[PDB]
Design an enzyme around this catalytic site. Sequence first.
Site, PDB file in Angstrom:
ATOM      1  N   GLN B  10       0.821  -1.206   0.000  1.00 45.56           N
ATOM      2  CA  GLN B  10       0.000   0.000   0.000  1.00 45.56           C
ATOM      3  C   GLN B  10       0.856   1.257   0.000  1.00 45.56           C
ATOM      4  O   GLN B  10       0.689   2.134  -0.859  1.00 45.56           O
ATOM      5  CB  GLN B  10      -0.947   0.015   1.194  1.00 45.56           C
ATOM      6  CG  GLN B  10      -1.959   1.141   1.106  1.00 45.56           C
ATOM      7  CD  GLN B  10      -3.255   0.826   1.804  1.00 45.56           C
ATOM      8  OE1 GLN B  10      -3.317  -0.059   2.654  1.00 45.56           O
ATOM      9  NE2 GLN B  10      -4.304   1.553   1.450  1.00 45.56           N
ATOM     10  N   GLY B 143       1.973  -6.924   6.537  1.00 49.97           N
ATOM     11  CA  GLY B 143       2.259  -8.332   6.317  1.00 49.97           C
ATOM     12  C   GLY B 143       2.758  -8.641   4.918  1.00 49.97           C
ATOM     13  O   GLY B 143       3.790  -9.294   4.745  1.00 49.97           O
ATOM     14  N   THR B 144       2.040  -8.163   3.899  1.00 47.21           N
ATOM     15  CA  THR B 144       2.449  -8.434   2.526  1.00 47.21           C
ATOM     16  C   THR B 144       3.698  -7.660   2.120  1.00 47.21           C
ATOM     17  O   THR B 144       4.583  -8.230   1.478  1.00 47.21           O
ATOM     18  CB  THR B 144       1.290  -8.163   1.555  1.00 47.21           C
ATOM     19  OG1 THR B 144       1.629  -8.663   0.256  1.00 47.21           O
ATOM     20  CG2 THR B 144       0.952  -6.686   1.452  1.00 47.21           C
ATOM     21  N   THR B 178       0.421   2.439  14.228  1.00 42.55           N
ATOM     22  CA  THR B 178      -0.809   2.173  13.498  1.00 42.55           C
ATOM     23  C   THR B 178      -1.361   0.771  13.727  1.00 42.55           C
ATOM     24  O   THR B 178      -2.581   0.590  13.688  1.00 42.55           O
ATOM     25  CB  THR B 178      -0.566   2.406  11.996  1.00 42.55           C
ATOM     26  OG1 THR B 178      -0.239   3.783  11.779  1.00 42.55           O
ATOM     27  CG2 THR B 178      -1.782   2.062  11.167  1.00 42.55           C
ATOM     28  N   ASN B 205       7.505   8.319   9.560  1.00 43.77           N
ATOM     29  CA  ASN B 205       6.400   9.231   9.278  1.00 43.77           C
ATOM     30  C   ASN B 205       6.349  10.416  10.240  1.00 43.77           C
ATOM     31  O   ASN B 205       5.972  11.525   9.842  1.00 43.77           O
ATOM     32  CB  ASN B 205       5.074   8.479   9.346  1.00 43.77           C
ATOM     33  CG  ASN B 205       4.893   7.511   8.207  1.00 43.77           C
ATOM     34  OD1 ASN B 205       4.450   7.883   7.122  1.00 43.77           O
ATOM     35  ND2 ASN B 205       5.226   6.251   8.447  1.00 43.77           N
ATOM     36  N   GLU B 253      28.728   4.197  -7.877  1.00 45.57           N
ATOM     37  CA  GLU B 253      29.586   5.075  -7.092  1.00 45.57           C
ATOM     38  C   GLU B 253      28.993   5.339  -5.716  1.00 45.57           C
ATOM     39  O   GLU B 253      29.746   5.502  -4.748  1.00 45.57           O
ATOM     40  CB  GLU B 253      29.836   6.376  -7.847  1.00 45.57           C
ATOM     41  CG  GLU B 253      30.457   6.161  -9.215  1.00 45.57           C
ATOM     42  CD  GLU B 253      30.864   7.458  -9.884  1.00 45.57           C
ATOM     43  OE1 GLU B 253      31.673   8.203  -9.295  1.00 45.57           O
ATOM     44  OE2 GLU B 253      30.375   7.729 -11.001  1.00 45.57           O
TER      45      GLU B 253
HETATM   46  N1  LIG Z   1       4.372   7.532   4.170  1.00 43.46           N
HETATM   47  C1  LIG Z   1       3.375   6.682   3.962  1.00 43.46           C
HETATM   48  N2  LIG Z   1       3.152   5.650   4.849  1.00 43.46           N
HETATM   49  C2  LIG Z   1       2.139   4.777   4.647  1.00 43.46           C
HETATM   50  C3  LIG Z   1       1.317   4.916   3.549  1.00 43.46           C
HETATM   51  N3  LIG Z   1       0.403   3.927   3.592  1.00 43.46           N
HETATM   52  C4  LIG Z   1       0.630   3.170   4.688  1.00 43.46           C
HETATM   53  N4  LIG Z   1       1.706   3.684   5.353  1.00 43.46           N
HETATM   54  C5  LIG Z   1       2.300   3.180   6.606  1.00 43.46           C
HETATM   55  O1  LIG Z   1       2.805   1.860   6.470  1.00 43.46           O
HETATM   56  C6  LIG Z   1       2.347   1.044   7.533  1.00 43.46           C
HETATM   57  C7  LIG Z   1       1.241   0.115   7.070  1.00 43.46           C
HETATM   58  O2  LIG Z   1       1.750  -0.746   6.085  1.00 43.46           O
HETATM   59  P1  LIG Z   1       0.830  -1.238   4.867  1.00 43.46           P
HETATM   60  O3  LIG Z   1       1.425  -0.791   3.557  1.00 43.46           O
HETATM   61  O4  LIG Z   1      -0.583  -0.740   5.027  1.00 43.46           O
HETATM   62  O5  LIG Z   1       0.896  -2.836   4.962  1.00 43.46           O
HETATM   63  P2  LIG Z   1       0.544  -3.716   3.671  1.00 43.46           P
HETATM   64  O6  LIG Z   1       1.712  -3.676   2.720  1.00 43.46           O
HETATM   65  O7  LIG Z   1      -0.714  -3.212   3.013  1.00 43.46           O
HETATM   66  O8  LIG Z   1       0.370  -5.206   4.236  1.00 43.46           O
HETATM   67  P3  LIG Z   1      -1.095  -5.843   4.386  1.00 43.46           P
HETATM   68  O9  LIG Z   1      -1.867  -5.078   5.428  1.00 43.46           O
HETATM   69  O10 LIG Z   1      -0.981  -7.288   4.799  1.00 43.46           O
HETATM   70  O11 LIG Z   1      -1.803  -5.750   3.061  1.00 43.46           O
HETATM   71  C8  LIG Z   1       1.831   1.991   8.587  1.00 43.46           C
HETATM   72  O12 LIG Z   1       2.887   2.411   9.413  1.00 43.46           O
HETATM   73  C9  LIG Z   1       1.321   3.150   7.764  1.00 43.46           C
HETATM   74  O13 LIG Z   1       1.403   4.345   8.499  1.00 43.46           O
HETATM   75  C10 LIG Z   1       1.533   5.951   2.654  1.00 43.46           C
HETATM   76  O14 LIG Z   1       0.807   6.082   1.674  1.00 43.46           O
HETATM   77  N5  LIG Z   1       2.564   6.835   2.863  1.00 43.46           N
HETATM   78 MG   LIG Z   2      -2.484  -3.998   2.280  1.00 40.06          MG
END
Ligand SMILES: Nc1nc2c(ncn2[C@@H]2O[C@H](COP(=O)(O)OP(=O)(O)OP(=O)(O)O)[C@@H](O)[C@H]2O)c(=O)[nH]1
Ligand SMILES: [Mg+2]
EC number: 3.6.5.-
Lengths: 430, 442, 442, 52, 332
Positions: B10, B143-144, B178, B205, B253
């Site tokens: 995500q 997780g993913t 989160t 963040n 480099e």
């Molecule tokens: N900077 C930033 N952080 C993000 C963003 N989206 C999610 N996060 C952060 O990343 C973490 C959540 O990870 P996710 O990417 O939602 O996890 P995932 O890859 O979707 O894994 P699954 O839930 O199993 O599908 C949290 O700490 C969120 O604050 C984003 O668009 N920008």
């Molecule tokens: Mg996800």
Amino acid sequence: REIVCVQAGQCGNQIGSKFWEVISDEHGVDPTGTYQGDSDLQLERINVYFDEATGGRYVPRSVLIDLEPGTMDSVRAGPYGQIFRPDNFIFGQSGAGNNWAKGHYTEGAELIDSVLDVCCKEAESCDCLQGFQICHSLGGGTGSGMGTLLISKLREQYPDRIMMTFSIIPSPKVSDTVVEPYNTTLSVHQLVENSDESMCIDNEALYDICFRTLKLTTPTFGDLNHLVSAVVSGVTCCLRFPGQLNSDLRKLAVNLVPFPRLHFFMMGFAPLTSRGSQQYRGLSVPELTQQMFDAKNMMQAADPRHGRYLTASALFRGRMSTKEVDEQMLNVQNKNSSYFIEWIPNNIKSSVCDIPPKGLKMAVTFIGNNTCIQEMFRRVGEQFTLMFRRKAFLHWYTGEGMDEMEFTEAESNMNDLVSEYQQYQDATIE
Amino acid sequence: REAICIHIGQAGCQVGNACWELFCLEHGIQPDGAMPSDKTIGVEDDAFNTFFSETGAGKHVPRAVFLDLEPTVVDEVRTGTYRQLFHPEQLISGKEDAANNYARGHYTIGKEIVDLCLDRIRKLADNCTGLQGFLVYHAVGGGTGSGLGALLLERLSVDYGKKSKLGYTVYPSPQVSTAVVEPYNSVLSTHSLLEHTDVAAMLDNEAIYDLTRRNLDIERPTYTNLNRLIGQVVSSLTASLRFDGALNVDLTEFQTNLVPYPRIHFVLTSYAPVISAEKAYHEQLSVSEISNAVFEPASMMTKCDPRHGKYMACCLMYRGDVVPKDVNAAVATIKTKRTIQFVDWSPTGFKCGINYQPPTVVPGGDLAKVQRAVCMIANSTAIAEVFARIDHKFDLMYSKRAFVHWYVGEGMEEGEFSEAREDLAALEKDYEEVGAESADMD
Amino acid sequence: REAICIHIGQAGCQVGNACWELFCLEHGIQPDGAMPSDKTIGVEDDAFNTFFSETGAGKHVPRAVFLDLEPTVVDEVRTGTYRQLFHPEQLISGKEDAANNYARGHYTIGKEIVDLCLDRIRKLADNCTGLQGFLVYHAVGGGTGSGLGALLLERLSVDYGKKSKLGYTVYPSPQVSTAVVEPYNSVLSTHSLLEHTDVAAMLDNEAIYDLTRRNLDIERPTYTNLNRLIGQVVSSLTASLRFDGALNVDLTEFQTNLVPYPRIHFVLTSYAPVISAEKAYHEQLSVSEISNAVFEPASMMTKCDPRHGKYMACCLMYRGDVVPKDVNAAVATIKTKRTIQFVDWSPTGFKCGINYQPPTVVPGGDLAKVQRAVCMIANSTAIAEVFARIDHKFDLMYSKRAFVHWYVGEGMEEGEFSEAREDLAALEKDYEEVGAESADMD
Amino acid sequence: VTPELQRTYHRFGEVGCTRRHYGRARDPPIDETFRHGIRTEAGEGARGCLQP
Amino acid sequence: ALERYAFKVDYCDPQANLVRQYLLLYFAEDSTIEMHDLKTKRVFLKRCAYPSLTPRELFIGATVGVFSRSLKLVDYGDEVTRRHFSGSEAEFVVFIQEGGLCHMGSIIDRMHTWELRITNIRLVDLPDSLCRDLGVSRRCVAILFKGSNAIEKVGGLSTEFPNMTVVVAEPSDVNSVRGAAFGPGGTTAVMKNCSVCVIKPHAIMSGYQGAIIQRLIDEGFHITALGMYSLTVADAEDFLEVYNGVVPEYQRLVEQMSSGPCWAVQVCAENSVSALRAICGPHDPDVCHVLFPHTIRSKYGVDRTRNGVHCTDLEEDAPLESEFFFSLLQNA
Ligand SMILES: Nc1nc2c(ncn2[C@@H]2O[C@H](COP(=O)(O)OP(=O)(O)OP(=O)(O)O)[C@@H](O)[C@H]2O)c(=O)[nH]1
Ligand SMILES: [Mg+2]
Ligand SMILES: Nc1nc2c(ncn2[C@@H]2O[C@H](COP(=O)(O)OP(=O)(O)OP(=O)(O)O)[C@@H](O)[C@H]2O)c(=O)[nH]1
Ligand SMILES: Nc1nc2c(ncn2[C@@H]2O[C@H](COP(=O)(O)OP(=O)(O)O)[C@@H](O)[C@H]2O)c(=O)[nH]1
Ligand SMILES: [Mg+2]
């Protein structure tokens, strides 16, 4: 009596572009290659640096080598770039990575045979071959590894000719790269065995020339490379114009080097003066001599006042009396006698050439063999010893394949060079 | 010349949207992948080639894949504004998420999807002639992103070998949080990331929120702002590949200059002229002010204080109207400072780059327009503090096996927790040992 | 060349508004920070540089910070007429006041704000190439002015070291008073100021009220009049940096000539042609009459009588159309008088300065237009009576600890009162001993 | 509907947008086309000094 | 205005005797140029500053000099430039009647200040049919020109110069006068007691032509013929035969005269050749700037190759040059 030039790496290729601009201007060659000069004296020695292609055009006897084509495409795209022969541009497909071992051992051996083929093709066409001229930096990656490799191959193939190098070396004051000491140490080890004469320049000295002497508000690398191209084109002037006391690269070597390891020289060019000041002071041999020995006008960070001159040479261009030249060189030797090695009865050679560089009434280039060069090498060796004790970045070089024993060998050879210079500074006649 | 981008989960896909928006706007490709019908001159130019390839009809398409296990974010890309830019095969989506389980992504679900990813990357790598690395965007908290990112990096590292892999990673913030299971996923991710990455860039963040509050005047920031800052950083780092300059820097480099020993590859990132339009008319922005700015901790994008450690190497990228002498004067002034310290075995601490293309302005953006910018990546022992707090949170949870039954049921031995925790303990000890001074007696 | 202005608390900010109004109008910068609209050529003259720096677009911005713990006065600056002149970072405001407690400013509340102030001053000092001092404006009677002024001067003195720091200070008048706790705050302020100030200028509101009643014809003065007079004095002292003249005087020359021993640095200030417009057109204002004027007690801006002491050094600044022969003739006439006495160890008692720029006229102002003016600063033993009377008022209140529980509750030991009172007693003894004749011994 | 002046005087602005000071809203809006910073003064060269 | 111009140019290679084509781009925000090669799809020159090139000189059929190469603009290489030059392609005719021959230099200078490009010019005598139809006199000067917003600009000649100009805008009349006034035919040049002055291409592009003609009128000379001709390399060689082996800049003069079109005037006066030589000045502008500051070559010349104007030196060749310009070139 023709010279073949080799330009290697970014620094070498950049300095070379300015050199060929300066040389084409002095002989009146248009950037299209057409002769447009205004005196027969220009044509009568054009063979020294240019070959003649069919019609009007002249082509410059130079080989361009680099590991990534970005610089080469920039030089070919420049305003004088078209003059260069297309078959003379040799390039690979991936960079040196700022790594000496990569440049020397893996991609070096891959390209090097095509460079020797081009250099041999150019050399065997000459009716009589004079020395080679090479420009490169020692601190880089491709510059150090293939420059010293190629130097070794040309020294194997032409041992009776002259070997000349111009080299830019890292200063501690303003470094651009972290791993400079390793590359410098390995390159100085290669040069002291292979070279006949090696010239050294510090970027810090060119900045101080520009800011203090020329008072430039915003100098650029084009200016530094123009100063270097000025000295490079000046050393060879007696090969290609008449004069009252001719000189030659071999005559320079025979008069400057007392023992075969002591072949490292300082450079200067005298009539440097700002456009505001030029109305206030005329050129004369005493004025040129005073600037010529002023450490302000020397292109290395070490200062002559901490050492002694073994030998020096001055080449004068212009119409001037020989009496004034001889007595000026005598007066300087007599008045500062503690700075000249006493077991040589006369340390300075002079030479006089009739034809000055365009827009100057007179000029001199100065070459000096002084023991204060040891401080520069010592500084590089200190930074190497700091880095080597901790294996700071060594896995890159070892991953290319080098044995650690090369590093201890290169340090020992450079340390011995420093020792050899230091012993003659601190000695008595007995 | 070429680089391939892999976006996972995500955070990585959402940051990818901002990155590709910026790279399009910088080169000038319209959102449908074409160019203006009028600006064509007859003989085009290679700068796009780092990120785009052209079809025989002259449409541009980008060298990226978007990977997710849940459909929703990729369906947003398919139905959004950039529908025509991406190739539809490149946008790969599964059926159901990895539910914050590293085990679910790595063992159960990612194993089905992983072979499609390798086939797409292979099809990309066959249509190249000078590939020089992979760029990876993911978050280690979910997780993913953790499980499939690790599995995919392992497979890429076996198949492609020596090619470099540079990761941009969003780590769990030190007190903003989160999800409950973040420590477990971050530890297990970091175990795989240690072996199979060449440089790792660290993000928090909470730092980008703080930076957007203090310098920009934003009371209520959201993820689009953070993603635009990350995209700007990536554009600055890859600009050295794409435009003319005084001192170029190839991606090899960076690794040669920044990494002293093969484990010491985690780096801090910062960006200087983050400033609003109203502030921009009260101040000049010369080289020395932004060089002084990049070393203040108020500029950093990771919540760590570098005054508690020693710098080992710095890489300074200047883009825009800058002259090398000002870089030299600035670096010498920085070197003079007493609150900035380098390890004594690294005397020549700096690498410089200088590029002529000034930073781009994005229509909805919040940064001002400026003639020059500098971006820094630096290696420092302070990073050891970031790992220690995650390890403390892991120790707190693992003392009671707080959630472990999910991981063991979804396929993992309990032993794997202890192995990863011991590997991170050894990484902490490496950062303790590398920072010491020895052989003082002579 | 450069000088940095620091404004602390309410009196210091209100005096700052008048100072920057005057310096803008004297150089000609518009209230929005621009040059006059009639010129179409590049800038030619450096005189603005002492107080303003220009942006690349040609806006001017001033070398000042405004520090306060309550918002109201800085918000008045933010919403006033000079809104566009200042950079918004320069206007720093806390949440709540120091409530006339030195302890609240120094220990509890100023400790939070102080690091921002040092970061702003550092950002200013980095954009200089010949900084030659700090100018500080504050009152020692109030809580935030005392506590934060002391804390900030201590930090500046450690961080910047040898750079000079000159304070303009509004002291509690000898019988006019505004708050009950003035003696405690003034004693505790003076304890810190003794160690951490290079020159101290003494002000009393009662004197500027008397001067505006007697010389000007103003029955009902208010703070804007006093602040405009102070601004004129500061402009006269700093004019030597900014305009051409026969005998210039650099700020280090003040320190060399005025201070005989390192503790004896408190100086009196006065100004000569304070005159109304109706009187001004009936009279010439030559050098000898105004030189005689600066020594009359009706001209002084501090409520002290110099007939009860001996002068050690005088510094006389003439600005406007004056010729050196007239300054020399005037000083020679002053020297003959018997009611003016110099200590016998200071034979060459005078320093002169001559500057060509006449004093500026402000559209709403109350001073007349005059071709010449003189300003005097002098070091004299008469100041010892002012401290002795403050100490007497302290002793009356302190004998029963009348209000101390506020100060002890906000964090200060009761012992600190006695330490400060003994240090000021030693300062009094310094003024008896320095004034003691020594030629009696043969 | 929140009036414009009161919205100017609210504590919080819109999500993800820069807010101006309330003593600055009446002024004309700022310009975004202009690019800030000082231009480097590049002039002259070493060729004029070397080749008058 | 524009943000980027784009033209394709041809360069006549003397060593190869081929004609090469390149692509020239001009960035107007900072005055830099860049050249590409069409046949190879490779870069010829980076963005380099070139202050001697200005946006006013960029138009179709013009000639520019970039690093000692003469480039001739041929065709638009982009549709932005094609749309910007959507006008400026219609050709109109302005006549000068008998009363206006004394003011013709000022007329030409005023046309040049109005951003108008002259594509041909001649001094002719028209047949009676066109004389009655158009409304002009027997002896007149016909100027053919093009440019942006041409008709509205040339309306000002009715009030600056009363009753000496006739403007033609209908395409049919333009075609008739193109067939009649120009093209092969006779000439009004005399064959004795004459001199020939030639305006070089660089002065044509810079546009001092009206000032030169008006100076000639002011000095008292009479213009008996005038026309514009384009010289091939062989024609330029045959024009400058007597200068071979005498002056050091023979080949440069050849390439300059073959670079573009040149104007040729004829002057009749008392001792015409010596008088014209005296008014033009010595061959080298450096001597002019010190000892002859009032001469034409001092104002409109920079070196020996580009001294502005050319005048006959030997009185034995004046009818030869007059014939070569007004019969051999004009008739065939
Ligand atoms: N900077 C930033 N952080 C993000 C963003 N989206 C999610 N996060 C952060 O990343 C973490 C959540 O990870 P996710 O990417 O939602 O996890 P995932 O890859 O979707 O894994 P699954 O839930 O199993 O599908 C949290 O700490 C969120 O604050 C984003 O668009 N920008
Ligand atoms: Mg996800
Ligand atoms: N000349 C002048 N003096 C002032 C002005 N305002 C206050 N004072 C004097 O300064 C002293 C009071 O100091 P304040 O500035 O009110 O103290 P403060 O800085 O506000 O400290 P806090 O009360 O804790 O906020 C008294 O002697 C007042 O007479 C002013 O505007 N002009
Ligand atoms: N004098 C001069 N120095 C240069 C130039 N280009 C690069 N350098 C210097 O050379 C060093 C970099 O070496 P480089 O040529 O990049 O090594 P390479 O990668 O092996 O080609 C740095 O110290 C640069 O400052 C130039 O044109 N002139
Ligand atoms: Mg208050």
